[PDB]
Structure formats: structure tokens, C-alpha cells
Design a protein around this motif. Sequence first.
Motif, mmCIF file in Angstrom:
data_model
loop_
_atom_site.group_PDB
_atom_site.id
_atom_site.type_symbol
_atom_site.label_atom_id
_atom_site.label_comp_id
_atom_site.label_asym_id
_atom_site.label_seq_id
_atom_site.Cartn_x
_atom_site.Cartn_y
_atom_site.Cartn_z
ATOM 1 N N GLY A 187 115.586 81.498 75.056
ATOM 2 C CA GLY A 187 115.687 80.092 75.389
ATOM 3 C C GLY A 187 114.324 79.453 75.571
ATOM 4 N N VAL A 188 114.125 78.342 74.880
ATOM 5 C CA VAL A 188 112.902 77.576 74.985
ATOM 6 C C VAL A 188 113.321 76.128 75.179
ATOM 7 N N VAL A 189 112.352 75.244 75.367
ATOM 8 C CA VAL A 189 112.642 73.828 75.547
ATOM 9 C C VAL A 189 111.795 73.071 74.537
ATOM 10 N N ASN A 190 112.427 72.231 73.720
ATOM 11 C CA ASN A 190 111.618 71.446 72.807
ATOM 12 C C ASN A 190 111.280 70.134 73.489
ATOM 13 N N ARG A 191 110.485 69.316 72.827
ATOM 14 C CA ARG A 191 110.158 68.037 73.417
ATOM 15 C C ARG A 191 111.074 66.960 72.870
ATOM 16 N N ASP A 226 108.195 62.484 74.261
ATOM 17 C CA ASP A 226 107.084 63.425 74.386
ATOM 18 C C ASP A 226 106.406 63.705 73.048
ATOM 19 N N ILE A 227 107.181 63.732 71.957
ATOM 20 C CA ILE A 227 106.620 63.896 70.616
ATOM 21 C C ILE A 227 105.725 62.713 70.267
ATOM 22 N N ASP A 228 106.173 61.500 70.593
ATOM 23 C CA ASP A 228 105.375 60.308 70.342
ATOM 24 C C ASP A 228 104.166 60.245 71.264
ATOM 25 N N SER A 259 110.225 72.588 62.471
ATOM 26 C CA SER A 259 108.779 72.563 62.452
ATOM 27 C C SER A 259 108.217 72.553 63.863
ATOM 28 N N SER A 260 108.934 71.919 64.805
ATOM 29 C CA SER A 260 108.521 71.881 66.207
ATOM 30 C C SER A 260 108.453 73.278 66.802
ATOM 31 N N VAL A 261 109.519 74.052 66.609
ATOM 32 C CA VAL A 261 109.588 75.412 67.123
ATOM 33 C C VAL A 261 108.584 76.303 66.414
ATOM 34 N N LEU A 262 108.383 76.087 65.110
ATOM 35 C CA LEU A 262 107.422 76.910 64.382
ATOM 36 C C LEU A 262 105.986 76.671 64.856
ATOM 37 N N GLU A 263 105.589 75.408 65.036
ATOM 38 C CA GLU A 263 104.232 75.136 65.506
ATOM 39 C C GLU A 263 104.053 75.509 66.978
ATOM 40 N N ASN A 264 105.114 75.412 67.791
ATOM 41 C CA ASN A 264 105.023 75.877 69.172
ATOM 42 C C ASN A 264 104.950 77.395 69.228
ATOM 43 N N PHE A 265 105.596 78.059 68.271
ATOM 44 C CA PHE A 265 105.516 79.504 68.137
ATOM 45 C C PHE A 265 104.112 79.933 67.749
ATOM 46 N N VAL A 266 103.454 79.141 66.902
ATOM 47 C CA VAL A 266 102.068 79.427 66.542
ATOM 48 C C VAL A 266 101.163 79.240 67.755
#
Lengths: 345, 100
Positions: free
Chosen positions: A233-237, A241-243, A45-52
Motif C-alpha cells: 500500500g502506497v499513497v499517490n498524490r 498536489d500534482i499541480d 507514471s506517478s507510481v513508476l516515477e515515485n518508485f524511481v
Amino acid sequence: MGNRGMEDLIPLVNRLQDAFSAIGQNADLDLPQIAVVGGQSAGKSSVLENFVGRDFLPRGSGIVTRRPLVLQLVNATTEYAEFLHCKGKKFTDFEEVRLEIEAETDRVTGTNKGISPVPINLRVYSPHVLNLTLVDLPGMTKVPVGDQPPDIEFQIRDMLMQFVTKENCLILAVSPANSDLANSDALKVAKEVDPQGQRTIGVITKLDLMDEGTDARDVLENKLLPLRRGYIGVVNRSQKDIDGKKDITAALAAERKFFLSHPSYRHLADRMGTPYLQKVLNQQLTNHIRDTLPGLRNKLQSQLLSIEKEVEEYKNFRPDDPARKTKALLQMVQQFAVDFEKRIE
Amino acid sequence: DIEFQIRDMLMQFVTKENCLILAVSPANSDLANSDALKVAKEVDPQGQRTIGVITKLDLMDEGTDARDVLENKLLPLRRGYIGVVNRSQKDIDGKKDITA
């Protein structure tokens, strides 16, 4: 939101689609569904919303995504969301949509790391979206945790084999920020269900979170790991950082700056990234559209070829001359005459 | 079947008597996503000859900790967990000794 690629792709496909609706046939381009896989805390869901481009999906450490989700994007005037099982409401705050949908998730599945085989339908009406279908998948486990029976991972595999193995289903194998790089359940499942990589996109993170002394240059250059589509390549949080709820612009900017500052990824700063990935995926969408168009085009050519003949019969049109009537007389008289011959001989 | 081959090879060594099982996973990767626990509970559901170790605690993701895990609270084991910290690649690169 955005983006400009989808906003530029929507009017041409809208004119094409409304032309296909004005002719009356049910002809659509069959846009791919988007399915992302992964393990516990895979940031799917993190990658999907960052993709949006905006943060509207439940995410975090451990398992957060616990129910499959059918996100039905529909082009409309105003942007909002509605449900099949929560009909009657229109929300304009996507964070609130996230909160009530995770309330639905843990109310159906409990709060003891439960899942449910029935997805959650979510129709997002927006003037910047297509008529798409996104299949968000839960964080898979391998051992029974929380309230899961010991047959949990096998029925998850069964759910995968019956849902995501269909044609035109994109498979997003995401290496998340919390988990290990080589223990990516998403990469495991992607290589086990589709070795060809025809509809499998591999997204990797932790290029800043790898073991110190190593780098993933041999893997991201499609050199150590042979992939047909290659890696982006991307970087998630992280959970901190999510909190702390970091915004999207500064996160992608810091991500790009790390890609620029690392000596093993400065040459990959242009070939990796969430906007670059979004550009590549929009390009794949456009390629699928204008590549499936010639088949439907020549099919309609052969179809309208039959109607062409019908106009030829209407080609002769002289209202209301008796020549048409006498021709009809000759056709009926000769027709009845041969029907009389087909009565005796 | 390289995974199944390694699996059969490890079953041939674990299914013997008095074979302790060190189910060792780093603190980055989730322990519930490793099949080491699945294999260990499959060969011994009690876990009486199974010791779980969570390593590389200095390489963990920001916002998480093994405080609730290593205390034998997230996953019930009889003898609990014992946590050590492995070394990064820089440690072999710089040749870090036993003392350090």
C-alpha cells in the motif's frame, strides 16, 4: 535517485555480465520488463516515477499517459536520455525530458485524448541503472472519449494480449488516488489476464482517500482479496498536489506518517510503502538472477566439458619433439590403411 | 461469467420497453471507466431514456471537480446530468436522517 540496493546489485551483475561477454557468448540474466496498467488517471507514471525516487513522467487527472513507452535503461557513465526517433540530443533535465516526450505524445496522437499503437522508445543512460525495459501503458478507457473510435477499448485489450501477456513481463496493478478503490481498472485487468498472480504485483492507494467509516485492512492483509504476491500500500498524490508539485521525500514521509497514524494501517506501515515495495522488487530481481544462474552454470559446465577434451589432445605438448610427429605418422598411416581396406572390402 | 450473468440479467430488464436507465457513478471513479455508459449507449445510442448521475461529490479528489462534467459538456447527453451526493459509511454509522 538511488537506490543502494540497485547500486549494490549492479557491480556483481556487471562482473558476471562482462565475464559472459569476455567468453563471447550472448548470455544475459533476462531481467523482467516492467509494465504498469490502469484506467484513466491511474497514476501509472506517478507510481513508476515515485518508485524511481524522482518525478520525471507525465501524470495528472484524466488521461495523461496516452502512448506506450519503452524505457530502455542502460548502464553508462553519465545519466541522460535519448530517443530512437529523436536521435542527436542528450538531455540532463528529466523534467525537460518529460515535457518534450509529452510534446511528442500529443503531437503524434493529437490533443483530443488520442493514443498510438507505436510506443515511444526512450534510452536512459545512467550509472545507477541496469539494462532494463519498462513498458509504460496508456490510461485505458471503456467508452470512446475525445477522438477515440467506439472500438477503442477492445483494441486496447488486443494491445495488452499481444504485448504484456508475454513471459517475464511484470504487471503492476495500481489503484490510483483520483479513481475509486474497488473500480480499479488495473486490478480488473490483472485479475482477468492473470488469475495466478505469478508475475502480478498489486499496489493500492487511497488508504487516506477511502470512504469514511471503512478501511482496507481485510484487503491489504491478503485476506479479503486472495493474491499470490499480496499487496503493498502506497499513497499517490491528488491533482492539487500534482499541480503544486510536491517533492518526493516529504510525500513519502507524510505517506508513512499516515500509515503510522491510522489504526487500521499502523501494523501495515512496515509491510506497505514505496521504499518497502522497492526493496521487495529489488529482492525479486536478485532472486530471479541467482535462481536462473544454476541452469546457465551447469549448461556452461556441460559446454566447457567439450573444450576440456580439446585440451587433453593438447595435454600432450612437447615442442617440437618427433614423438608427436611419429604419432601423427602412425595415425595417418593406419587411417590411410583402413581407408584402403574400406576401398576393397 | 458472473459479470456476463449480471449483464444478461440486466439486458432482460432493460431491453423491455420504457425502461429508464440510471447510470450512476461516484465522483471519485471516472465515468469514462464505467461500463454503465457503454451498456446504456449500446441499448440506446441517443440516450433518450438514460439519466447519468454522479454521486459522492463531498468525497472527491483534491484538484478535480465535476463542474465541466455535470453541465453536459464533457459527454453530450440530451437531458444532461443531475447530480446528487450519496452518504459515506459514517452516515449509516451515525444514522443520519432525511432532513440532515
